[PDB]
Design a protein around this ligand. Sequence first.
Ligand SMILES: *[C@@H]1O[C@H](CO)[C@@H](O)[C@H](O)[C@H]1NC(C)=O
Lengths: 24, 50
Amino acid sequence: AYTNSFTRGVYYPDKVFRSSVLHS
Amino acid sequence: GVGHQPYRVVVLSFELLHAPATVCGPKKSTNLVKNKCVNFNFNGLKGTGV
Ligand SMILES: *[C@@H]1O[C@H](CO)[C@@H](O)[C@H](O)[C@H]1NC(C)=O
């Protein structure tokens, strides 16, 4: 069986704090 | 021969990650001064500011 993953599967790539920014 | 003799070797591997660090040499920690332009050192990070 299969199902839609949607927008799941996003983690923090590093432990550096960033605020109000669009980061690649 | 000298090269064929046994050698005890230790390789030290270390990480420059920005996690809270734990392993470093004996350095005295001074008092904290706020709201003043001072030089500062935090876990080997050097800077100058308020
Ligand atoms: C994902 O799975 C569903 C059900 O198995 C199927 O209808 C759909 O076509 C699949 N989509 C892709 C992109 O594989």
